[model samples]
Target chain A: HMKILFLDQSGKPGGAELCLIDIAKPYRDRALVGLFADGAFKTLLEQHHIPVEVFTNQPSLGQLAPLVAKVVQTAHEYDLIYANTQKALVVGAIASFIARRPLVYHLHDILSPEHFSQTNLRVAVNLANRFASLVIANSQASQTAFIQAGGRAELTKVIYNGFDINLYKTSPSDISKLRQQLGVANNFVVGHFSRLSPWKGQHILIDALAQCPPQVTAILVGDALFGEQDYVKELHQQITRLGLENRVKFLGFRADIPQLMAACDLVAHTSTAPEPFGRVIVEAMLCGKPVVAAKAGGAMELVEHGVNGFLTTPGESQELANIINTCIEDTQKTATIASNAQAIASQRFDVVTINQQIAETLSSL
Target chain B: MKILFLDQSGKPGGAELCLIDIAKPYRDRALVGLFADGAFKTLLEQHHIPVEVFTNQPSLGQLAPLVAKVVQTAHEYDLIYANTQKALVVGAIASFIARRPLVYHLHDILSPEHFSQTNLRVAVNLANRFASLVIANSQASQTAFIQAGGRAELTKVIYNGFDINLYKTSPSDISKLRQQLGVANNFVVGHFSRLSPWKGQHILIDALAQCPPQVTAILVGDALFGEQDYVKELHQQITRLGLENRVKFLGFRADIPQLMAACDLVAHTSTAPEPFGRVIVEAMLCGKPVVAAKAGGAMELVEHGVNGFLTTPGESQELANIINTCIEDTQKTATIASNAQAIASQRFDVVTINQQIAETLSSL
Candidate 1:
């Protein structure tokens, strides 16, 4: 019955935020989600009946004393701190030192030079290595990157995103009903399910759609979850300018992810940059949809071309289009591969087993 | 013998500025080491003082870079002088390693109101364990150190010194500046020093709202570090109070002497107990009627309606009353301003204060 003070910085329900919800849900009775910003993430946490507190900070200040004082004082009552983001880690590392509590950092982002400045990267690494007793990286890429940037190898562990495997089981009747309602019944749907980030590569899938045949339509299943509307603005322009406006549907963040994935014949994981761990890639596998994932980072390990799913070279629309054409032509072969991936995913990423590993790690600490 | 003077700030804030005058005496036989490189270094070079700037980055606990370099250099000096809190941390360690007697110059309140409780403990205990002498900026800082478990015998209260001649301005230029600043007929209230959260810039703005319409405010300094949002918030509060035209933000002006002289009254409204309210003494040296917040070093600088007015800290109502009094009674306010100028010139003279510091260094 260890009390946990979980800190995150997102105001929106992103991949890390959703991953944290699953991690924190089990410890809800004695745990609290302490956010730096206020918005839909708090609502999402409350919808799951988890105890949440918003220690809101105004604007992009480098640091301050008042916010730290409040968090440090609140941390006194908790037995452990689980920092889930970079900003959260900054506060948690300092707060854990003052409150005399053990800190666990869930390394969800790459500590790569391209993503962060030298100043910010060094500060995050130094603080993490100095204070954190344990660092749970989401992928091997993340764990390797942390160690490369002077993080302690002894403290780092790789833990993939856990999910309730039963959530992806949608009946065939319901899937057809959703497809008809979504107006994609006549089309060979390619579901691209991620927020419209430049690196998330919603644009890559849109570019691939133009190279494909008229029957091959795509539906982007998420909105720009952050205030990054610039990428979405350009995506819409690309759709209109290419004369493929009606061929693509932008269904902004529907709750029925399973039904939406099940409606599609093929799902695409089109991140131009490497993902820490492709949670959506595994979700597509569980939905029994043949997936085409970018061959980089954690996505490479998740998909084997023509074995369980297809692996396309990152940022190459022609490679992605060629794979999608193959999936559309051979329905019997695609369905069999999707079924094989579903079985592999079900065995590897079960929620109860993932949670037991986390519990065991915390017990050792 | 040479002295090794260490200061942590890149910019010359109150403490660093004070250290310039203290270090000016030992310019020939001293080494001034700074942790950060900025305008402070250029200013030191301009004054012909020797300086060494250490790279200020976040490679800490490894300690191989700065601690090693400073320890190697610390052996060269007869006395080690820590000029700021962060410098004290480095100085404390370097003194132990280099076997040089450490002299810490504390310029903060060292209380929970200003610093984190852990910082207070670190600052106090580090001084107790390492420093041979702790020169506090005021008695408030000295007593604060003592309450936080610092050694009483090691502590010595010494007020910050200044070059009083720099604050002296000509009357021929001030009225022109008042017209340029749009405070010609208005009863201008000038608040100097950096705009910060605990500096209570908002307290003055809130109180300025309650004062008479003719009473305008001119904020003379800009934000330092992450407190830029508070400066924006001050402007929003000014417009929200409909005192938009009444207040003018002079963002980090170099001409402090002219700005202080242009004001009918100077206000110091720090909410926390300031170690030594440099602006209070600066305003006094400018020969302007100063309404100081009654706590810490401001209490030591100003007497209620004698040399200056001392209203309670954070009490904008009391501060407003003092400002209104200065506005109504011009003759009385003028006499107190003259009294303050005479007292500040005599008491806070740079040469005399440095003499006191020299005696302490000699004893150590």
Candidate 2:
């Protein structure tokens, strides 16, 4: 296989960066990463021994001159070019022109005016259709949006995010320590481990807390780095104002995810909007916990209501509160839900099976 | 139409100052405004005319700021005259948002690499579609520009006309000045203009390398201020050639007619085509036997064996023969000088031509 160049603009590592690492792991010998800024993501790629270069002057007009020069110099040494973001798509398209090479654009977001400027969106879509040899969309929704916005349907493909269930499993000792440390030894803990953002419905979770008793506590973990600091502040204020400060403990940004999931009595993914794919719900299922996720986006595809785990109406606090109370009070019902959730997560999100699907797609290409 | 002229520079160079003078006659009915700073604003207002300075900065590359200044001052103007290439493109694009007509005054041939940059063709084409009309300084300038991918339909040739009556001379003072300079009996060969490289002051020096020692050559122009090294080289070449006694450097002169009067013959030794050869016509009107390099507008202005002598361009020996033959021969010199003066006075007098220019504007 020839060298494959991947261009991503984010400085922080997120689900998208994790998905890229998975995609590149099998082809590490042939893969090269071009990052827009130097940060944790660059450090992760360096640890993997994948060649990575940072394009420091990110998102400046006419500053693309030096970036384009670097791209052309590197493109000559590489075979395939893959752009991960919209700005990367624009830069990669021009670089492909000057280098006379094939380019592939990975579409991560739905084409919307709110996410991108009209001029930039038009340039992205135009360049994608005209220049890219292939367009890899993260979900069917993203693929459809690209087609509606004049992206070529013939060249685009929908690739669902794959996860490794083996890495997601929890150990018994870590679970015991997590439960002991939280002082929830005799109480039920409902875990929602997404970043604290408004769209994630942390406020709805706070509203649900008003209905739940003191024995059933909610652990809201994860830090808000993507401009959700105000929401984090509001969640803190709401906890104080409602007099539910003892029941609600904010564990900001924890790395021991499997340990935390094992400690929880149940896990909930209460997002107000449709998530592209809920990685947390799958992780919760793998940890043998009863999961209650909002019935939206990939959450509906991942969970079957009353079969695997309970599915509540998104943005409805009463329904969410009822689901939480029912799971906590009924131990038999919770065991049955956890067993079914574990079975489903092992079958679908298994690392070996998902890796095979990715390999098969690449082989066909 | 009320005209607003937007030029990049405030300094009144040849083309810009000529444009100001040409548009001055319409100041009463059609108000003329400027969007630049410098001596040009002072020169215009010195005539009791209205002028506006747009900015104080010198460089034109920071286009966004320059265009912002132009748009702020362009309000209420009916038409715009962009006097240079960069200002033309910037003003034309800006005027579209402001809703005004733009006239681009193109003074140089766009094809010559010496006058253009790598992206000059694309820039000119972009400006062409936006401008209402493109005014060329000379017919040759227009033709060369069009052949080099300029839009022909948008073009018009307007020859640069000057007031020829400004060169009236007194022959007695010229003779007494000649005697004081010790050239009263000798055939005084002179070249009067700025001492610059492209002006070919050195070519005239080279042509004198072959001239007889009895023939005195007076280079009546100052060394261009910035190019002092070229001046040093010229002095060294004269010393090496041992013509210091015969050749004289009179420096820059404002009284061009008085200098032309003191000379028996005049030379136009420019290596490049003098877009319009303003000095070639000026020298002819001074009633001196004029010999010019046969290139650009000089070919049309100087007949081969008639009003003035035309030698092969860039040939020092050919230039020397024309100068030597014209000086020793009296009848040919007198006849050609008188004919050139008569033709120039009738054809290029500013009062009549400027009135014609006013009529053109009125018709529009």
Candidate 3:
């Protein structure tokens, strides 16, 4: 196996950071995650027994000079550099040139005119095009955006974020126990997993709960990091005003994602804006939960409506509520769709195949 | 002789602008390969210089594309001259790949205050290994380069050259310009440089607060390279000091020498050690008593109460004292200005500077 240097620019573990854990698992012994800042991501990496180092979080030309030098020095022992974030792509490009190694950039963002500033789009696209030997995009949507933003078509490859299929398969013993832990009493639990950022549309899920029957209770499994604390306050106020206080649960940022997903009958992903569906959407499929996602961006690509999962127009709480009620009422049909998604997600997003593709791509260089 | 010159900036900084004169003589045979294109390319076009934009847009294959083209381009030339830090790295590689001699112009201070340690190391090591000549803009720049492990034998100090005639404005023209600016009776101090935090435009505002009400300050340059925050801070500082009426932001102007000519005193207030004192020398050539920060190249250009006065960098009180002394005594300040004009005119003429550069390239 080739030694790798993985670089990411998150202090908190977002969807990309969670996905990195699986891609990094196979190479954990030989790879090191070079994080730009010290936080939960580093702690998470440590929990998984992956080697990681916290570099500078400061953004400036002078600060980058030292960061590049350190990356170059650390690069000598590694076979290649795998830049996992945009800021990392810049440092990776220079270090790859100086250290005489190839670089692989994992583009996770859409990089469209509407998504990013013109300056940042060019910077990320140009650096990857010129220096990166390969750019592994999470989805075709991300890959298409990269090409549109001046990325060389040949340099980019669409590799969906892989997951450990076994992680979502919780023991049959804990399913009821965990539901009790979430204080559920024979409720049709709808789980929303992600940060409490408004862009994630946590409020839409809360509003959807207001429209759903009292039996259809919701569990918001993630919490605020980049979001201001006011979103949590507003959600509580909205819950009390809608008289859905007893129907909702806020389990702020839990590591027990699989156990939580297993306890729920359905998983809901309501993004107000364009996101490459999500790692949570894929993980929900692996957990055999019927996913009702906002029909926007990559969510359109992943789920075939009524086949594997359901899609509603993004930001429409009524459409989302309609899908939720269908899943709650038509139990056998929902189970069949979830079963098909579970089987398909296992074959397509196996961690070994995903990491093998990465290895082969790296080995080609 | 054919020369392949390389520069990285799209905007004409002091170093890139100085490279224009050196590039003028060999405009016929020399090819200035710019890594990025902007106003600098147009400046070269207007000057009738042979130039090529290696990376046309920011989105192109930047570092790798430029390096290969410059390497191949180097094979066609007799000499290579790298004009900036990014230029130096590419030029160093090109010089080795083509087996051509490199002339790295050390226009930056190779110190921790100005640059990162890795950058300083990268420059010194590259020049020592691949360059035939490392031309520093001042002794302070040269000394820092040498101290940073640059080869002493490969280096020579050469101050940036200027056309002396540009600074020689008539008193009638200056008086009319002062009236045009509405500062005809006020004792004006002009601060010229990009509105960066390091440039210390904020320092002049502080010094103006300490001076008399009639002592006005005009900041002559605007933000470059995303320093709009500092420009905002300067306005906030002027308001905080309640010297809003005394201070004016001219933003940017083409007539730098004429503006320096109109001023009662020109101040160079860089908080960091400047690689070379371009504004200090320009102010001197304008025949105005200049006050410079007391460090780096500023030390080499000024002497106390001689051609100019020096103040501790980042400190406003010392700069205030110099401004007050010039305001109090007009005759002595004019004599100091004359002494500076005489030295600067003789020493920094373009014809002489270009000759030295031509001879150096010829030697290689």
Candidate 4:
């Protein structure tokens, strides 16, 4: 098996890192991670028995000579380098020049002025055009953005994130405990699992709480790791200021994400900005929970209004609250949404099917 | 405006050190930044001027080694003086090739390195191509360097610096050092330089063997740190000649003025061509008669039979005869010493000559 080196700059495990771990796990014996720094995600990699090396001496673009030396040294050991971020794209491109090795850049984030810094976007686009033999984009929106931002039209491909739906199946014993803990023994609980950042729009959910009745409590889960402490503080202030303190419990990042999803009566994905892909929405669907997400990015692809889970205009908390109240008051309606979501999630996110697709892509390369 | 003289090395051992006091004092108006750590930077700092040392010895390019980083860091400076051949090329290229105003400080014989593939030729070409002004230490160095692949168009001359005040010699102090050195009332002929192959310590010893016992020859200055084997050979030769009592080896010294003051006559016995004979002129500044080999800038500096004597390079008998005549003949030694000091004081004073260098830079 040819060794594949995966390189990334972020220390925190985000959606992209999660996707990388899932896809790379099957080929774990043949793959290694090359991170810029070590943190929680590196610790997670260690748990899976994967070897990861850090190359911290790699400089920003101004100093190209030392970076050239680092690339030359690193490229000799690995057959191929898979750059996971934009900065990695620039570094990997230079590495390819020195070592004469092929590079593949995973274009997970949006490279546009509307999404990220324009200078970084342009550099990413230029690097994609010059060095990346293949550009793996997360969605059609990402591929479109790449092409619009001067990426080579022919070099791009869209690969949706795959999930293991079987693990997310609800257990009767766990569901009972989740219901007791949420303080909604008789009431419905609308659960949202994401980092407590302004972009995740936890405040929007509290605003939605004001519109919904006292019977429903929105359980906000997931913690911020990348200096989103100010947003967490602001979210707490908003929860108390809105007088919806009882309805919204700001649950921080939890390890038992699957169990938590299985416990929810309903799930919500409220993001003010475009999410590259909504993993929480998929997790909720796999758990057979009724999910309502904003109509932006992958949420539009995953959720079908009144078919599987509900989809609303982005940042429209009042409409989201109305939809949640409707599902809570009617038992049959909630069951129908949940059952439809469970079927779609099984078809789309099943590990066997997703792994087959991933294997096929790798074989083609 | 103050000027800063940034040097790449620490030791003020060569032509770079010779230019230091003149250019460094201008640091009161200008700032100097060195890219490497050295003793020279410490010496400048001791004079109450601030200096910026950016790297240690044997520093590699950790980042961009190109002009981008060098120019970016030193962009604010009004003008740059590239004292050595490497800095001359780096700064000259940054000025013209990379677009900055640079003054090239030419001090070495360039061609021998290129013909021998010494890696200094690359520096020679770049300095010639980019320098706004080239301040050559001597005309002989200018001609030899240009012929050996230095730029002919950029070349101009500036003589070596001599402190005029230090030359007001005291006979009592001279006699005291001579008595302490055990060469009292003796005709002391001294070669003031490091015991290196190129400085021709071996040739000086060969000439000393031919001199009489009364002509007590003093070999001043230590053997270079890396040339210990050469020093051993010289010590062995002194033992073999049975002239141990006559030939005195004084390894390295700081009291150059006092040493030159004590010597009855001074000798510049380099077998290799010198860029400019700073020691030969220094001996003249101390009011002592001088004899240098007829090679490099020595031929231009010394007027034979008038101020100082010139002998054929690598000729021991010619050097021995010149030394004997200077030592034995008191009338001739006093006449040459007085005439050479008059010429040297007029021509090589730091204030008068360095002004010429400043004017050349200003004109550019």
Candidate 5:
């Protein structure tokens, strides 16, 4: 096994962090995740028996010199430095050059002005162009964004995030128990499983909730991570304004996302901006739930409209509401699409198969 | 023309102070946008210059938002002039986004020891790629910039301008100032710069130890940025060399021209290559005999044993020899000082330099 030093900036276990958990598990005996800060992600890694370390430093230009120096010193022992975030890519790129180590950047974000800052896009693309040996983009959209931002096309390859599909296979008893616990047993439930941010379009989903029938309820299943408490408060205000206090549930950041997906009648991915990779959409599909994803970015690649899943125009509440209404009205057709989605997602994103691809790529390097 | 001036810092340094002069002439048609908030904003406001503080959210990770903000604000202006290295990086990106022409004022020396590799690379790459024009402080700065992977074609040298009349001192007034400081008979040398290590304040102390008993030195500046360690080191060196009585530290002072005029001689002892020795020209404009380190922009400003003296950088003995000669041969040294004042006053007058800036910018 190749000795890898995985570098990530956030301590919070977002889509990237969760994906990294599964990707790093097979190489747990030889690999280490070097986090920039301490957070719930470290605990999640510890729970999985993965080796992890936190490197904390002040966020200033003066401190960055010492931080980069420390990373370079630590990078000497590792065969490869795998940067998993933008800040990680910045530090890892310089450290890789200084330590004479190969670098692999796991490009999780879209390098567009809509998604990233000009500095971040420039810094990441420049470093990746000059230093990174391989760029493992999560989707074609991510790869395209990287290339548009001046990354080398030859260095990049699309690698979809893997999942243990078995965990998503919820039995009828477990699904019924989760439904009863959520108090949405009798309601036609729609689940939205992204962090509470403005771009995530939780308000768009809430607006759609008001247009749906009285029995149609929504459960928002994630908390705000990037200091978007104002958006979270706005979401509550939106629910109250639309008289959705009884119809909506804010299940803030639950670890049991699969069970929640299994209990819901449908999952909604209503991001106003283009998503680099809609991890929640994939997760919802794996749970055998019909998904309505916004028509942009990786969502275009993931969902097939009127077949395995539904695609709605981004930020259009009526389009989203129409789809949710169809899922409730056309039971047999929705069930058929959900079954097709589960069958496709299970085979396409099997953890074992994804790990082998990653292993082959790393070994070739 | 309407100008949008971008500056990264809110603290007034030599570069920021120089910018005040350049911006003062165009205040009616210019806006000075500072990235950070501080006394520099207050200084600009006091001069009736339209100044605004643009503070971005603490997501250096998210530079796009800040760049967007700057670009949006810059759209109303005709041109963008970046005054510092960080400002060059931000202004370059904003200029590209806004489709505005960018002019970078190259204030820093592109020396590896003085700046980090990342910073130097960022500044050079951005300026080269996006800037339409690069105004270097000196030819030495322009040459160093080219050597360090900067675009040569875009560069033009412009020395910092000063009001020569403000620096001139009457002999009676200088005598009174020297008498008030109780150094009337003593041959006092004033070293006027920050307490930074590369500025070589300790080298002055070492040279002071070699000078005559009556030759006392006063360090007329304090630590401005982040070089307090060098200040502590200088203090310990002063005590260890038993030169506590001979050397005095006056920290930071506002009355620099008055202080320079009162001194018998001025010393510019930078161990590193300076971008442009502003103090060397300022001292010469004040009619003081100044000895500068023979490197970087200082070499261009001073002709050895002619208008001013030049010493080997970091060489205490060479510096001591020059200072001793200035004291021993007063007649020849006075002639050199007179020649320096005449040359500097004619070459670096604010009115003439400002017109050159206006002409160059208009042509661009």
Candidate 6:
């Protein structure tokens, strides 16, 4: 039972933060999650009976040295420091040097120019190269980006985010109840589960919805973080311009994602840029819903077109619209694909298996 | 050549001050991009040097965005000259991305104890990988660079140039300035650097206490960068030694050559190795007797008992003994000071040094 000091910078529950909850479950007795800010992620951790503490209050550029010093001081009680975000990796790298502890960086984001700044990519790669003992990348795309940005190849290992497949197994009554609650009982529902950022492509989904039939309604199920409110406003304007006010549902942010995924007739992962790992796609698959993901990044590995899930060209609403229409029109074919996806996703991303892998990796260190 | 000069700080330290002279000759064709905003930017504007303040205050961990911005900005320039360690790191990455040639001006002592592990490694590794030329302030700094795993073939020594004519003072004018400072009768030893701990203002105070009653020391600069605590410490040491009346803190001033000329002697008491002893040459150019610490670039600058005196680093007693000798043997010290002025004026004139730098950079 090794004591781990888990570090993360986000206050809100993104894909990475949600993944951390499942990964931290087994080590709850001897681990601590050091959050950079206080928010819903802290509540989520505490609900699972995990030890967590907020270490910073909205960090500024000038506050980094003191933040690193605080992390170094806190790291003295732990066996290892596991950095779960880029900012965490930055602080953790320096703290590892100061504390003389081994560091493990979990590469959550793609280290490309489209997603991160050049300074961020360089700093992340440089620090990880100099300090990290192991880098647990969420996807092969992320690992490739890390290496392209000068990260050491030997330090990286691809580990897809783990999930508790049982939580996603919705009963028939539960699915029916969620459909009625969302008022999408008569509509051909399509779920889009990501933050309302331009790259995440909520606008692209809105465009695709306009191309579809009147019965095909879309539920946009996440709020913007990182001052992306203008994008959310643009999305609403786009929905209104396309006359999707009644056809599209803006289900801002909801805790019951698995229930939401179950209620939808088809789930969509429409991002204009490459996603590091399409967590929403896997979550929808685990819920036995047909998923159509953008054809880039880790989505390439997860979805086999017409086999488990569908892959459409990124940023192309016409391609996405065609796929969603196929899922709605071909009922027998969509059912076979969704069932195959659930079977594969449950076996591939089982929390028990991921925990065992993580344990073995930690013990080796 | 159109030059994109990258500097990390906006403080007017020795390197930044030296850069004003270097940039002046190419002001029309060059631009100085400062990482932080401060007094140096004002100085550059006053000198008519083209400068822009890059106000993105990214942490050392968040250097990627800064690098991208610099790379984008550097595309219009023909060459990049990185003036400081942080600038070197940023320029190195920008140079690689922008596909531009880079020249790094090495102004810091690359000693492990003096710098953090992350900074030293980042600077040396980046310079080694990306720099087309490494211009060191002194041979001592160049040697330290090689020892710290910096590439040897890329390095070239270019001592800081002085505008020699500005330093020549009339005897009557020096006497008048001395009287105005109220140190006409006292043997005033001027310490002409920033009030930083490693620059050894406290060490000079300890030495001042060991000197005779008539020998008073004037500290001629303010606390630089984040060294206000050191200024406080020096003040406390002055009070504790009962030398408040004998010692004077004449915070930062612009008329440096006049101050050096007004002094009976100038002291360079850096406890750590200096990258280059700019004050030693400046004092010599002002025809003042100088006693420097025996280690680092000061050793390369001063010849013992010939042009100037050399004392053991951080030793107050040895510094006191040298100060006493200079005051006691004024005739011999005056002759040495004159010889030093003659040698330094001809060798380190701004015109010659700038030409050498320009030629070396062109070759690169």
State which candidate has the highest TM-score: 6
Candidate 6, residues A168-257, lDDT tens digits: the string is 988989889889988889999999998888989888889989899889999989877779989888988988898899988888888889
What TM value does model 5 have? 0.60
How close is every model to the real structure, measured as TM-score?
0.58, 0.61, 0.57, 0.57, 0.60, 0.65
Expressed as tens digits, the lDDT of each residue in B214-267 for candidate 1 is 999888776776887887888888889898888888888989878999998998
Instruction: Estimate, for each residue in B1-364, the C-alpha lDDT of model 5 and write its tens digit.
Output: 8999989889997789899999998899999988888999999999999998775443332423455577788888999999988788668756754668999999888888777776776678778877889999999889878988999999999889999899977789888988888788889999998888888989989999899989999898767557877888998999998988888788788888888988888999999888889899999999889999999999889888788999999999999999999999999999999999999998889988898899889987
Cα-based lDDT at residue B253, candidate 5: 86
Better of 1 and 5 by TM-score: 5
DockQ of 5: 0.04
Interface RMSD of each: 10.2, 10.8, 9.1, 10.3, 7.3, 7.7
Q: What is candidate 2's lDDT per residue for A1-365, written digit by digit as tens? A: 76778888776777777677877777788888888777998888888887788874322112213555577568877887888877678768756754557888988777766555665566678778877988888776677778877788998877666667766677777777778889987778889898888878988888998898878888998888667788888988998999988988889888788788889988989999777678788888888889999887667777899878989989999999998888867889789989988988898877677778756655565
Collision pairs in model 3: none
lDDT of 4 by residue, B110-176 (tens): 6564345433544555565556677788987788767767778778888878788786668888777
Model 3 share of native interface contacts: 0.00
Window of ten residues with lowest summed lDDT in model 2 chain B = B56-65
Q: Residue B161 lDDT in model 5?
A: 96
lDDT of 4 by residue, A273-330 (tens): 8777798998998888899898887788788888899888889989899888888777
**What's the distance in Å from true for residue A282, model 3?**
1.1
TM-score of chain A of each: 0.95, 0.90, 0.94, 0.94, 0.96, 0.95
Clashing pairs in 5: A117-B64, A118-B64, B222-B251
Candidate 1's docking class is: incorrect
Model 4 pairs in collision: A222-A253, A223-A253, B2-B29, B2-B30, B3-B30, B10-B38, B10-B39, B95-B100, B221-B252, B222-B252
> What is every candidate's C-alpha DockQ against the true complex, given to 2 decimals?
0.03, 0.05, 0.03, 0.07, 0.04, 0.06
Q: lDDT of each structure?
A: 0.85, 0.75, 0.85, 0.75, 0.87, 0.86
